[PDB]
């Protein structure tokens, strides 16, 4: 009837998705073999549809759809879509006072898709990746947003899952995810959890209470334009300024350069959370001419520290709008791929004067791994 219901984190830059099997969450892997699909749609002049990976490291941004989480169940007026829009490379227009995406669906061929048929898009894509897994059809899902989501917000991420063909069970708070995967729901008494997330775009802070597993959001607070992105535009920074200063050339001039060095900056990111030095390399780069540089973990912190320190800002904040102290929290949760960067995580340790966060599930896959959980108990 419910069939295998399928937990999905629907997230602004990447998106996860989760199932019960034989006793456990399952993070499922796509088609290239990541556990984590970007939140892109584009379009190539033949008229092929790319979601995904394939849409984001397409070499090319018109008719590249990404970020419609910002544009869900807003209207077009709406003051937050109105300074978005300045940043977006694609065309939103104003169709039933929704914000539409206007794009060229290939040989000049133009159409309009609201908001909620990009997510349907993505969300058909997180379908596709557990139907492959499963080995049979899936109609129905678990879908979480962000604590702070209205009505409209929820209700739009409820029909971009009818359009991808899901039945959206139940909308579930982010933090919340977070939290039911470290089990922080099988306990007694009452308990504060902060919960830091720090995604690919996005910064958000949620101070929850659990009241004999149940869940209660008391304050949230972060910035909806400081997220993983932004550490791999300040190495990109210093990259296309040195390569002036080596060659007196100007990287920004051919777009597919900028590509590639963004996609080699971002693996580059991830290696430096492990180890202490990464190499980037590229061919042909810059007029013919090759690119071989390295980067240290100590730079990249160097690069970063402003923004890196700007994340302990909202924390103070919630605490304050939750009349609570450091100290009167019980649990710290690390949300995003982002918080595995050894920085951020000494930064948010001193802030809890050495309390040490929530481990064992990855931080890009907790919101997805609670999701599951509760796909779970739905499922039988
Ligand atoms: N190991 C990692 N070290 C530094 N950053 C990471 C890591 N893994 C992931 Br995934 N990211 C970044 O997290 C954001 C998505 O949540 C994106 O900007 C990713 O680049």
Redesign the pocket.
Known sequence: DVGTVVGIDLGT??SCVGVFKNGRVEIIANDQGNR?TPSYVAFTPEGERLIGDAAKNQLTPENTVFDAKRLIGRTWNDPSVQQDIKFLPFKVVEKKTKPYIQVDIGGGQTKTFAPEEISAMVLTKMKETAEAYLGKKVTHAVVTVPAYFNDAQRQATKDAGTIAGLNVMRIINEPTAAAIAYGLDKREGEKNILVFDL??GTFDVSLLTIDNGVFEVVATNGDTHL???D??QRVMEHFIKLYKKKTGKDVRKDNRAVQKLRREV?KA??AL?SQHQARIEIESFYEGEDFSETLTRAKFEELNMDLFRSTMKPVQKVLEDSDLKKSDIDEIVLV???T??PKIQQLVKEFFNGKEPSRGINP?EAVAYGAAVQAGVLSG
């Open positions: 830059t990447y984590i995604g690919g997220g993983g992105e550490f791999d971002e990111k991830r959370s995003g791929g982002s595995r960067i890009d």
